[PDB]
């Protein structure tokens, strides 16, 4: 049975906050298709040949 994620319990309380003291400059990749192969079909040659 696949795990959804690691279990993390957030320490919520009514008068406490968590403030970051540092940062990470993260570069992530996003790959997006833009175009396809442009195809042309000769209808007469495909159906009938010569």
């Amino acid at each position: 049975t696949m795990s959804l994620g690691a279990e993390n319990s957030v320490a919520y309380s009514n008068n406490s906050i968590a403030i970051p003291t540092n940062f990470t400059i993260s570069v992530t990749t996003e790959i997006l298709p833009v175009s396809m192969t442009k195809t042309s079909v000769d209808c007469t040659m495909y159906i009938c040949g010569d």
Partner: protein
């Protein structure tokens, strides 16, 4: 003729497909020539049951 209009707008239009036509017909068959014995089958006096 392809666009079915007498006025053609500016652009590129796919019209037809150029294909080179054959120049002459060549028939290649085996050189060996023997008269086929259809006379034996079709003109026989007796046939089987």
């Amino acid at each position: 003729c392809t666009l079915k209009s007498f006025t053609v707008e500016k652009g590129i239009y796919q019209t037809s497909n150029f294909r080179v036509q054959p120049t002459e017909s060549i028939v290649r068959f085996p050189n060996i020539t023997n008269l086929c014995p259809f006379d034996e089958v079709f003109n026989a006096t007796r046939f089987a049951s």
